[PDB]
Amino acid sequence: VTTFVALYDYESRTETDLSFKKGERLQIVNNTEGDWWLAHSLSTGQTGYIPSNYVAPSDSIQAEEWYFGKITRRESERLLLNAENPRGTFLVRESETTKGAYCLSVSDFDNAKGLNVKHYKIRKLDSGGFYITSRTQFNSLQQLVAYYSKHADGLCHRLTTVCPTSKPQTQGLAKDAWEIPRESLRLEVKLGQGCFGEVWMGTWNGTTRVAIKTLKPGTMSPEAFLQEAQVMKKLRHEKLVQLYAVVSEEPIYIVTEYMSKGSLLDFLKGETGKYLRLPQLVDMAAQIASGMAYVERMNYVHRDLRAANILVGENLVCKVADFGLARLIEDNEYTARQGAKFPIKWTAPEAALYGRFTIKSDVWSFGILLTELTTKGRVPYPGMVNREVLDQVERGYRMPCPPECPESLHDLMCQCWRKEPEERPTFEYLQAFLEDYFTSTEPQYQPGENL
Numbered sequence: 001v002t003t004f005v006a007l008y009d010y011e012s013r014t015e016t017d018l019s020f021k022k023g024e025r026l027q028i029v030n031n032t033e034g035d036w037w038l039a040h041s042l043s044t045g046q047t048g049y050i051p052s053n054y055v056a057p058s059d060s061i062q063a064e065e066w067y068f069g070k071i072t073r074r075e076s077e078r079l080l081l082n083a084e085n086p087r088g089t090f091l092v093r094e095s096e097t098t099k100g101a102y103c104l105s106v107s108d109f110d111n112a113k114g115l116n117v118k119h120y121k122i123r124k125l126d127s128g129g130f131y132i133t134s135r136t137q138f139n140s141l142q143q144l145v146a147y148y149s150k151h152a153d154g155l156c157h158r159l160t161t162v163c164p165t166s167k168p169q170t171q172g173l174a175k176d177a178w179e180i181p182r183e184s185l186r187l188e189v190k191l192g193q194g195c196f197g198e199v200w201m202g203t204w205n206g207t208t209r210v211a212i213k214t215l216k217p218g219t220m221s222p223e224a225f226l227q228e229a230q231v232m233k234k235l236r237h238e239k240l241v242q243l244y245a246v247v248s249e250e251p252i253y254i255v256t257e258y259m260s261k262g263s264l265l266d267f268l269k270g271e272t273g274k275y276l277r278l279p280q281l282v283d284m285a286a287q288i289a290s291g292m293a294y295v296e297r298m299n300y301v302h303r304d305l306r307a308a309n310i311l312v313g314e315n316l317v318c319k320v321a322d323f324g325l326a327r328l329i330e331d332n333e334y335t336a337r338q339g340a341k342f343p344i345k346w347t348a349p350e351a352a353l354y355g356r357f358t359i360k361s362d363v364w365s366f367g368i369l370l371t372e373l374t375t376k377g378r379v380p381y382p383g384m385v386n387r388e389v390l391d392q393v394e395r396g397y398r399m400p401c402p403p404e405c406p407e408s409l410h411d412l413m414c415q416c417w418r419k420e421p422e423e424r425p426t427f428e429y430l431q432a433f434l435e436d437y438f439t440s441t442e443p444q445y446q447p448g449e450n451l
């Protein structure tokens with residue numbers, strides 16, 4: 001057995017789990033898998049279950065504050081470019097492209113490019129040591145990071161601030177927490193009204209901040225929902241709002257990861273919103289596409305993808321919410337894809353006409369969402385009304401490229417609107433197309449040739 005070190009405070013919720021503060025020494029049995037592990041605190045003496053993502057071995061590279069694991073290139077830039085981060089804010093991560101190399105990412109400022117991240121490959125020596133340039137080597141990553149925190153010696157900037165992060169969200173409210181009773185949940189601020197319920201900020205067991213969706217009675221069966229949520233429960237992805245739990249007594253409450261800065265449509269309208277440029281819009285659309293790509297890999301269907309059901313967080317993280325919920329609603333109008341409650345303008349016509357909701361109808365929607373993203377939230381088909389959008393779409397019509405949308409993107413929307421589902425692109429493609437939309441020249445990594 002290995003002592004692990006805590007990387008974040010975790011305020012004990014239930015009986016059976018453990019409170020600990022960042023730094024505590026915890027004892028666990030090596031070969032454990034799963035999301036919740038059994039720990040004995042050699043610090044506190046207390047014992048319980050802990051979320052496995054909140055610890056790392058003692059004295060291993062992972063243990064360090066600045067070590068961000070196998071986070072992605074595109075997402076490290078998200079965290080580093082936070083505008084409160086001084087120059088020299090850094091992190092260390094695993095390289096996505098060179099088998100076992102690590103990579104040091106560092107914020108800098110440049111007259112041409114503004115504030116930008118510079119990525120340095122760190123290769124491991126025959127000695128187990130580490131080097132950014134052959135000229136300057138160490139026996140460990142920690143020595144390396146120490147040294148460049150004192151002089152840039154080649155680096156764009158001396159390392160100053162460990163990259164600031166947030167506590168990850170655990171995977172579940174605690175071990176064995178799926179269905180919970182109303183009284184564990186406290187509704188504090190109500191956040192908005194839907195067509196079939198409300199959305200709330202709240203707290204579970206007086207500790208964890210949660211979102212709480214409350215369903216209007218008669219909307220779905222609590223039976224149908226629960227059997228559905230055995231599926232949703234399994235969809236874990238960093239761009240899907242995580243489904244924590246549920247109260248299966250009418251009225252259904254659905255407990256979800258709190259998203260701090262609200263719906264995407266809201267956020268696009270209104271300030272912090274009126275001034276985003278395309279490369280951040282396109283980075284948002286790529287985040288949604290990575291969420292939907294996982295949905296795609298899991299043979300699932302969202303059924304109401306659009307900006308109103310994307311939530312936004314810190315640093316413009318975007319996440320897909322309320323997936324596969326819309327199927328279970330019983331409102332004989334809505335289910336007919338009729339009425340004031342049905343997003344006809346985002347609905348692929350085969351869904352509108354034949355209930356044929358599939359991952360490809362979700363690709364249609366995604367194309368509409370791209371117009372929402374390039375208009376800062378303007379309604380789609382602006383001159384039309386809903387009652388008329390079906391005929392017009394079945395008769396061949398499509399949206400002209402919004403003013404101020406690069407035609408390369410608009411032609412992507414047009415693949416999303418191709419008449420025959422099976423010739424619309426996949427989400428894998430939509431994801432790769434957008435994480436690579438802007439092509440610079442060679443400086444992928446800084447050449448450590450000699451610095």
Ligand SMILES: C=CC(=O)N(C1CC1)[C@@H](C(=O)NC1CCCC1)c1cc(F)cc(F)c1
Nearest residue numbers: 194195196197198213304309322325326341
């Ligand atoms: C009528 C417009 C609307 O807001 N919808 C309707 C589907 C269009 C909301 C909705 O009512 N949400 C309420 C239930 C819990 C919180 C508030 C909705 C969005 C989805 F992504 C999936 C759903 F199943 C439902």
